[PDB]
Amino acid sequence: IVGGYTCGANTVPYQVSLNSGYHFCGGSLINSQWVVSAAHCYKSGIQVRLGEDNINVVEGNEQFISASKSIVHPSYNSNTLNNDIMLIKLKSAASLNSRVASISLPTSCASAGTQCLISGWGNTKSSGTSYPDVLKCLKAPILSDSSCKSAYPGQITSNMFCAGYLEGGKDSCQGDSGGPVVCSGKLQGIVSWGSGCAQKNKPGVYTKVCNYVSWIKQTIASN
């Protein structure tokens, strides 16, 4: 997260860290046994880390649970990043409390102008590299489809939306991939892609979760 603030320990209780020896992506806990992330975060051997703030220090509220199955969206296209969404089943149910909790799925899509919260452990600089150890947060609005398509001609599908600031300075960045975009208490987006981080006229692009609720629910109900 570039240009954000320190969330505060366990203030984003649905945020998870995907770990393969090191943090490599975020995700969101949608129930006691399932996490949703980006398909471009797929790899074998994932451990899901819940209840984290400092990812390099054991602080007492963590739960470390291995993944038992990963399901990449059937129509994911790695070249365009269309359908950039993945489900991860945990080997055992998480223990839900005030610091580890699930985030609701949306019943309706959020409209442009809605303010959302984006969070992650990604890079905090637009030029250079500095990775924080504690969770960072950014408040950002959903941008109009027109402004999003104008920023990225020929690249935005109906399964994507832009959020952030056209003037730059504030954005998600490398290492935030797969993490949540939460608006009015519902998961509306997944950190997907962009052109660099926090550059003028290049806002972040996010997977539009409201298009995938049926697939998510049917998949969880049969796996």
DSSP state letter for 170: -
Is residue 179 a contact partner of residue 35, using CB atoms and an 8 Å limit? Answer: no
Nearer to Ca ion, 54 or 80 (CB): 54
**Minimum Å distance from CB 1 to Ca ion?**
18
Q: What is the dihedral of CA 63, 68, 72, 78, to 10 degrees?
A: 80
Whole-number Å distance between alpha carbons of 214 and 223 = 14
Q: Is 174 annotated as a binding residue?
A: yes
Residue 133 binds Ca ion (CB under 5 A): no
Q: Is 4 annotated as a binding residue?
A: no
Nearer to Ca ion, 52 or 176 (CB): 52
Phi, psi of 220 (to 5 degrees): -65, -35
Catalytic residue among 17, 84, 102, 119: 84
Bridge partners, residue 120, by sequence: 136
Task: Respond yes or no: is residue 40 known to be catalytic.
Answer: yes
Q: Is 62 annotated as a binding residue?
A: yes
**Residues in 44-63 that interact with Ca ion by CB under 5 A:** 52, 54, 59
Q: How many residues bind Ca ion (CB under 5 A)?
A: 3
Task: Respond yes or no: is residue 176 known to be catalytic.
Answer: no
Nearer to Ca ion, 49 or 186 (CB): 49
Q: Where do the H-state alpha helices sit in 82-212?
A: 145-151
Q: Is 83 annotated as a binding residue?
A: no
Write b or e for each residue in 4-18: b if 16 or more Cβ atoms lie within 10 A of its Cβ, otherwise e: beebebbebbbbbbb
Task: Respond yes or no: is residue 177 known to be catalytic.
Answer: yes
Write out the residues near Ca ion by the rule CB under 5 A. Answer: 52, 54, 59
**Annotated binding-site residue numbers for substrate:** 171-172, 174-175, 177
Residues belonging to the active site: 40, 84, 177
